[model samples]
Each structure stands twice: as C-alpha cells, then as structure tokens.
Target: LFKTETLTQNCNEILKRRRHVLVGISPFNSRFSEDYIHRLIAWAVREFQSVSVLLAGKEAANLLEALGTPHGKAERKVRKEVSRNRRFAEKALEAHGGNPEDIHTFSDFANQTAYRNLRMEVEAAFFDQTHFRNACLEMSHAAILVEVSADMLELAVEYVIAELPFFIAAPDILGVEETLLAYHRPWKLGEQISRNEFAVKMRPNQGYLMVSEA
Candidate 1:
C-alpha cells in the first residue's frame, strides 16, 4: 500500500515545481466583468511564479463572421473588444505585480509551428475521437442562443475545433511545457458540469460578493 503522507508530500513537491499557470479569457463573453478578471489575476499572481492570460481574439472575430457579419466589420469590432479585454488583463497584472508580457491573445501565436501542428491535431481528433466529437457538438449546441441550423452548427463546430488547441497547448506556447497549471471557470459556478482534463476549476466569488459603496 502507498503511504498517504508520502503521496501528499510528493504531490506538493510536484505542484511547487510547476510555477507557471495560464488563464484563457473569451472576449466574446459579455458576462465576465472587469473585476472578475482582476480578481482572477490577483489570485494567480499570489499563487504562481508566472501567470499568463490569453484573450480569444481570433475566435471572437471568427464567431462574428460565422454569424454573417462582414469580414472587415468583424475584424474591427473584435479588435476594439480585444483591446478592452487586454486593458483589463494589463491592469490586473500590474495590480498583482505580474509581468506585462504574460498577456497573450489567440492571434499572437497563430503563426507558431507548434500552434499550427496542434490545431491540425485537434481538427483530426474531432473527426476520429467519438467522445471528443460528441463533446464538440454538445458545446456547439450550447454556444448558440438563437434557432440552430446546418449552417450555424457548421460554424460553431469550426470555432470550437479551432479553439481546442489553446486549452491543450497553452503551457507549451508559453514556454513552460512540464510545469504549468491552467485555470477554467464554468459558465456558472453552482451548476454540475463535466470538463476535460486540461484546466483546474477556478471560482470567482468576489464579483458576486460586492456591494455598492456610498
């Protein structure tokens, strides 16, 4: 039998070695308030030696295009929105004494060889892995708020597949392959949900706990 104390110590040692962590934020999501992201960055800085925030700028733009917006309009809107999100990240990083360079966006790494390879791998996995494909479809369905159709489903699927590599390869992209932690928040905190083995579930209770000061 394995000794419980030894196992605990070993796990603690391993966790300490991996001092880098990544948090990916979806710029398209309107629900994430500035304070929510700030608190997350604060917590991350307190916990890890290196913290990186990835804004999903490319995915956000593609989503608009999929919804029938013109390419130039979509790009312009996404650029403006991404800049706002980047400011939130930057402010949080400075507040928490983290490095400014740790901030990233999906477009930032698109040209990297590893990112391209990972994107291809994720695309192939969506076709070959039954569970992964089902999960993708499920997420695609959840992504839409309006009536669904073949065209909408196709667009959702493309967006989801394109974004999958970010979750799997974020640490590698940031140059911390073996020792990186990833954080993910659910759509809502109270709901029971199943997630992949990529990121740890993070809680953001500060926003909900706030009261107006007069």
Candidate 2:
C-alpha cells in the first residue's frame, strides 16, 4: 500500500510548495538509532535546501515530572537525553553537510516573542475549545505515557502548541507559508497536528528514507 514511488510523489508535492522542511524528534520515543538518524538527515539534506530538526526536550521533561519523577532529576535526565539526541542530529548534519545550527530544542525557541505569543493563543484555544483540549490530552496520554492532572494541563498544552509551528505556517519563527512540516506519521483526524488554520502540508518520512533505502 505504501510504496516509495508514492512517497516520492507526496514529497514532490511539498517541494513544489517550498524547499524547506522541519523534521521532528520526540524525546519521549527512542525508536530512532544513530544510523537511522544519519540516514534520515542525509536524505533530508540531499533533498531540501533548508532542513531543520526540532527536539522536544522541555515538553518531555514535563511529562517525566507528571509521571512522578522529581522535577530536578527529570530536568537533569532531559538535559542528558536531549544532549544525546542533539549530538546525533549534529553528527548526521555534519555527515550530510547540513548546518548544525539548524538542530534545536523546544526550549531554544521558547523565549522568542513570537513563540511566546503564539503559545498564549494556543493556550486560549485549548481552554475555549473542548475538542481541542481533549485532543491534546489524548496526545499526552498516548505519546508521552502520562496522565496529566488538572494542574498539569498547562504543561500538556505545551506539547500541542509546540507542534503548531509544524501544522501551521510559523512565519515569525520558521519562515514563510511554503515551508513543509515533515514527520514519520500522521495524527488522527481530530488531533492537533491533523488540523491547523494555515493548513500546512506534511511530507512523509518515507521520502526522507528513500535515498538511504536505495
């Protein structure tokens, strides 16, 4: 059902929109190995002129804390894991001749005025829209393996909003509307990644894997 030919077709659709792509790495999942990371980055580098990676360090730390890990220990563990992941990305970037500076953590963009303002808007939307709130909660439980308490809703909200840049055009942060958000999988229909105002297009991971597979 899922073929490389179809993957290329899908990838080209985004290339028609823009040459830039944002690859996501979740700190919650360790499915990616060094070789996998290198292959993905190498393929991405060969295809897109502007390739970037986003690692959700702080968000992962929040989930760890919610799961009963002490805050300080959680943060320390997050830092170590994030650093390891970042190093992996950097190695891939260097091997592929991509810019190491393009590798970043959620915390790196957290302080920007644009990001802060955008997050506030998402937070408002989360509280105002019941379905949106539930979707975020569902994502939190499914991906991060933590049941967020009422008090920790704010932290959970961060996951959804942090992903907004990918689902929507984040001109202030990433660039213009034409940038493509690349990921390995899709969210369910009602999920945050599945819906956005700008309706940003996504490129499948298969496209990035094509070269490596060959």
Give the number of the best model, judged by lDDT: 2
Predicted candidate 2 versus true structure: per-residue lDDT over 1-214, tens digit per residue? 1112213355456665546767777675755678778877777787767888878747677777667788899889988888888999999998889999887666676778866776676667667877767766766665554335765655655666676544444445654344554555554522333335222333242122222145
Task: List lDDT for all candidates, in order.
Answer: 0.59, 0.62
TM-score of 1: 0.72
Error of 1 at 97 (Å): 0.3
All-Cα superposition RMSD per candidate? 8.5, 5.0
> Using alpha carbons, what is the TM-score of model 2?
0.76
Compared with the true structure, what per-residue lDDT tens digits does model 1 show for residues 83-202? 888898898898889987788876677888867877777677677766666666667656543456667666767666665555545555556643332334333211211233222211
Instruction: Please list the residue runs of candidate 1 whose C-alpha ends up more than 4 Å from where it truly belongs after superposition.
Output: 1-18, 129-131, 179-184, 187-214
What TM-scores do the predictions have? 0.72, 0.76
Instruction: Give the lDDT of residue 40 in candidate 2.
Output: 79
Q: How many clashing pairs per prediction, in order? A: 0, 0
